[PDB]
């Protein structure tokens, strides 16, 4: 039962520090090449650090002087100490075991999220996206100015799923997120059916039910 | 008297894999080093402690000449205070190294269309080599807690890998022949410059 | 060493052959290359190492080849679980690097988006900001252009947009764009329009409203 279980990710202010850990089973961390690979949201894989069985360590230029890779043989655990964190270090961080030409990077952790930001936790404002002012009508909810991710959206307490699109949030220049959730329905339904979006934001313990009507 | 046989190191037809680097013990002879420093064009001729130009003026008990082939990007590891797969697991110079490191591109000799697979290096080793240590083990590398029992498999890796030099490789991936001259001071001195 | 994958997106049907390219900036031994699969929300998964060695448990339809600067991942007969992102990797340096990824997506017939424009709500206007939202619903292929116009002036630098993942039922995409202005700037203009260009549209489609109607 070979696995890598990561821990330690979370929210941190710019200039702060975090330590990630990666507990291994089914192989010996100190006997292997081990790596940290990160993926910023929506982007590719960036290999940031590697440690050799004999102890040598190497870093991508993007993290040199700030990140330190290390391990504890007695706990069979890999670590990544991250200092002087910046917004652009926001990413899912993976640990992995490398075999290079003898077998590729074959074992991967499940990933842990690191979010670097100076924004403070804030629940969303929820505004109607209202249709009228053709066969299909569109309505929705604009879930604006919250931090941090994630928010959930449902419609009519889960009774409405067909035609729902909840979009990836966008990060605004304020450091707060904004998200839209929409649903298309038959236009003859606007006058007969009630539509309510249910927004939940765990981190601020905010829950809002917003009814959306034609204007 | 008898001239030190440097051609019999530098001009050898075949060179060793780095993991099994060869060492020639040079003794009772006279050696001109200024000729080497002018005998060919070497892409690297770095001396530590001694001077390439001002070298024929000294005396030593024995001179060691170590030679092997590595990849162009790895020549920088053949220096004191370095790390990497070669410095750590194949050929290690001491921090206090006095000697010279000579290298030249050997693409025309050691590369082959379709890959030359004769030159190997050690990929897996539990700990770093001591200086001037030579590890020629081919025991299966145990990367987990289960013994390998001579069989390759999961967590059980043959420790050597082939460079696979091809003539079309980028220069950093081309083969380089390396000679490391090491100067021993112990006993009557037996190698001297003129 | 920079690895460049092409194409950025491969659009195919199940049962078809996928050919994915990775080009290295520097000619390198085949032993230094590897290929990975990544599905949404999951860690990468190794497929091929040493350019051509299939990893343990990886289906036979996956094979890799190439040498020097040009490497290829082939999926001989695409299965539904193969639509994912693929990454090449080189480990000749320490640390190595990855390619930027190739997405393999479901191909389907062209489908024009339905387009909707939403005024800012009066509740939001109370707070001093106006968000105008434009929705492009269920289109294919993914390439679409949204042009915001305010009193027919083309707007640049004041909108953000976001796209869904390919729909599991009809294989389309949807796009949501938000134009953000201050309430004061919003009240200085009348006509707000969203002009959409897409392969499925004969000519651009503009939805609009006039502030205060
Ligand atoms: C190797 O042979 C060449 C060609 O004859 C000669 O010029 C060179 O000095 C030789 N190298 C050594 C170290 O003797």
Of C106, C125, C147, the residue that ends a domain is C106
State how far the Cα of C28 lies from the Cα of C44, in Å rounded to an integer: 23
Chain C residue with minimum CA distance to B154 = C56
Tokens 């340096």, located at residue: C93
C3 neighbors C22 (Cβ within 8 angstroms): yes
3-state class (DSSP) for residue C208: strand
Contacts of C87 (CB under 8 A, 6+ apart): A44, A45, C5, C35, C36, C37, C38, C44, C98, C99, C101
Of C53, C74, C106, the residue that ends a domain is C106
Prior bond to A114 cis, omega within 30? no
Residue B3 Cβ inside 6 Å of ligand 1? The answer reads: no
Contact residues, chain C, for B89 at CB < 8 Å: none
A145 neighbors A122 (Cβ within 8 angstroms): yes
State how far the Cα of B152 lies from the Cα of B138, in Å rounded to an integer: 12
B58 is written with which tokens?
A: 């000294």
State how far the Cα of B193 lies from the Cα of C163, in Å rounded to an integer: 76
Breaks (C-N over 2.5 A) in chain B follow: 186
* A47 vs C32, C45, C95: nearest CB: C95
Prior bond to A69 cis, omega within 30? no
Beta strand A11-12 with A67-72: parallel, antiparallel or unpaired? Answer: unpaired
A200 neighbors A170 (Cβ within 8 angstroms): no
Prior bond to C141 cis, omega within 30? yes
Chain C residue with minimum CA distance to B173 = C28
Domain count along chain C = 2
CATH assignment at residue C130: 2.60.40.10
* C94 vs A50, A109, A140: nearest CB: A50
A141 neighbors A198 (Cβ within 8 angstroms): no
State how far the Cα of B23 lies from the Cα of B91, in Å rounded to an integer: 12
Is CATH 3.30.70.1840 the classification given to domain B7-132+163-192? Answer: yes
Question: What are the strands of the beta sheet with B44-48, ordered from one edge?
Answer: B22-26, B62-71, B175-184, B99-105, B44-48
Residue (of C35, C62, C39, C37) closest to C50 by Cα position: C35
Residue (of A103, A104, A121) closest to A177 by Cα position: A121
Verify whether the Cβ–Cβ distance A127 to C98 is below 8 Å. Answer: no
Q: Which atom of ligand 1 is nearest to the CA of B35?
A: 9
Domain ranges in chain A? 3-116, 125-212
**B100 in the Ramachandran plot: left (φ > 0), alpha (ψ -120 to 50) or beta?**
beta
Domain ranges in chain B? 7-132+163-192
Residue (of B106, B123, B96, B128) closest to B174 by Cα position: B106
Q: How many Cβ atoms sit within 10 Å of the Cβ of residue C28?
A: 25
**A157 in the Ramachandran plot: left (φ > 0), alpha (ψ -120 to 50) or beta?**
left
What CATH code would you report for A3-116? 2.60.40.10
Beta strand A125-129 with A136-146: parallel, antiparallel or unpaired? Answer: antiparallel
3-state class (DSSP) for residue C164: coil
Tokens 């220096």, located at residue: B79
Beta strands in chain A (DSSP E): 3-7, 11-12, 18-25, 33-39, 46-51, 57-59, 67-72, 77-82, 91-98, 105-108, 112-116, 125-129, 136-146, 152-155, 164-166, 170-171, 177-186, 196-201, 206-211
What is the distance in angstroms between the CA of the first residue and the CA of the last residue of chain A?
59
b/e B150-165 (16+ beta carbons within 10 angstroms → b):
eeeeebbbebbbbbbb
| DSSP states of B11-58 | T-SS--BGGG-EEEEE-SEE--HHHHHHHS--SEEEEESS-SGGGTT-
State how far the Cα of B105 lies from the Cα of B176, in Å rounded to an integer: 4
For residue C182, what are the domain limits? 114-210
Size of interface A-C (CB pairs under 8 A): 144
Pick the CATH number of A125-212 from 3.40.50.1100, 3.30.465.10, 2.60.40.10, 3.50.50.60: 2.60.40.10
Beta strands in C29-94 (DSSP E): 33-38, 45-49, 53-54, 62-75, 85-90
Nearest-5° angle of CA C123, CA C124, CA C127?
A: 105
Q: How far is the CA of B35 from the centre of ligand 1 (A)?
A: 9
Beta strand C9-12 with C102-106: parallel, antiparallel or unpaired? Answer: parallel
Question: In terms of domains, do C53 and C119 share one?
Answer: no
| DSSP states of C64-76 | EEEEEEEEEEEES
Phi, psi of B42 (to 5 degrees): -110, 140
Residue (of A127, A122, A118) closest to A146 by Cα position: A122
State how far the Cα of C132 lies from the Cα of C129, in Å rounded to an integer: 10
Cα A1 versus chain centre, distance: 27
């Amino acid at each position: 039962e070979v696995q890598l279980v990561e821990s330690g990710g979370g929210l941190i202010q710019p200039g702060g520090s975090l330590r990630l850990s990666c507990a291994a089973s089914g192989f010996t961390v100190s006997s292997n090449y081990m790596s940290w690979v990160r993926q910023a949201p929506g982007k590719g894989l960036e290999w940031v650090s590697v440690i050799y069985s004999g102890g040598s360590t190497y870093y991508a230029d993007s993290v040199k002087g700030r990140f330190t890779i290390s391990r504890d043989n007695s706990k069979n655990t890999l670590y990544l100490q991250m200092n002087s964190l910046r917004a652009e270090d926001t990413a899912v961080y993976y640990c992995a075991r490398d075999l290079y030409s003898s077998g590729g990077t074959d074992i991967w952790g499940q990933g842990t999220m690191v979010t670097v930001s100076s924004a403070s936790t804030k629940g969303p404002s929820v505004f109607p996206l209202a249709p009228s002012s053709g066969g299909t009508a569109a309505l929705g909810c604009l879930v604006k100015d919250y931090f941090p991710e994630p928010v959930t959206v449902s419609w009519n307490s889960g009774a409405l799923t067909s035609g729902v699109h909840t979009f990836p949030a966008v990060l605004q220049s304020s450091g707060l997120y904004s998200l839209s959730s929409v649903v298309t329905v038959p236009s003859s339904s606007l006058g007969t059916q009630t539509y309510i979006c249910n927004v939940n934001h765990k981190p601020s313990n905010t829950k809002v039910d917003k009814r959306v009507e034609p204007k | 008297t008898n001239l030190c046989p440097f051609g019999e190191v530098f001009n050898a037809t075949r060179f060793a894999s780095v993991y099994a680097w060869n060492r020639k013990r040079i003794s009772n002879c006279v050696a001109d080093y200024s000729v080497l420093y002018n005998s060919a064009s070497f892409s690297t001729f770095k001396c530590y402690g001694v001077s390439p130009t001002k070298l024929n003026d000294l005396c030593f008990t024995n001179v060691y000449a170590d030679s092997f082939v590595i990849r162009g990007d790895e020549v920088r590891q053949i220096a004191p205070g370095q790390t990497g797969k070669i410095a750590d697991y194949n050929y290690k110079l001491p921090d206090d190294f006095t000697g010279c490191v000579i290298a030249w591109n050997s693409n025309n000799l050691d590369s082959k269309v379709g890959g030359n697979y004769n030159y190997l290096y050690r990929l897996f080793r539990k700990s770093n080599l001591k200086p001037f240590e030579r590890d020629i083990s081919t025991e299966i590398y145990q990367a987990g807690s289960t013994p390998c029992n001579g069989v390759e498999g999961f967590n059980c890796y043959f420790p050597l890998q082939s460079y696979g030099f091809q003539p079309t490789n980028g220069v950093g991936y081309q083969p380089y022949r390396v000679v490391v001259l090491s100067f021993e001071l112990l006993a009557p001195a037996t190698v001297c410059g003129p | 060493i920079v690895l460049t994958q092409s194409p950025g997106t491969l659009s195919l049907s199940p049962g078809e052959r996928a050919t994915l390219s990775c080009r290295a900036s520097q000619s390198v031994s085949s032993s230094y290359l590897a290929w990975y699969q990544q599905k949404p929300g999951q860690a990468p998964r190794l497929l091929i190492y040493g350019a051509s060695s299939r990893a343990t448990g990886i289906p036979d339809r996956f094979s890799g080849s190439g040498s020097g600067t040009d490497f290829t991942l082939t999926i001989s007969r695409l299965e539904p679980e193969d639509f994912a992102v693929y990454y090449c990797q080189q480990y000749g340096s320490s640390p190595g690097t990855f390619g930027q990824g190739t997405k393999v997506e479901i191909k389907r017939t062209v489908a024009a988006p339905s387009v909707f424009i939403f005024p800012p709500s009066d509740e939001q206007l109370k707070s001093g900001t106006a968000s105008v939202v434009c929705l492009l619903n269920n289109f294919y292929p993914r390439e679409a252009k949204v042009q915001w116009k305010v009193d027919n002036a083309l707007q640049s630098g004041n909108s953000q947009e976001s796209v869904t993942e390919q729909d599991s039922k009809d294989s389309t995409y949807s796009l949501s764009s938000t134009l953000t202005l201050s309430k004061a700037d919003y009240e200085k203009h009348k006509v707000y329009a969203c002009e959409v260009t897409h392969q499925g549209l004969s000519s651009p489609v503009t939805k609009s409203f006039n502030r205060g109607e």
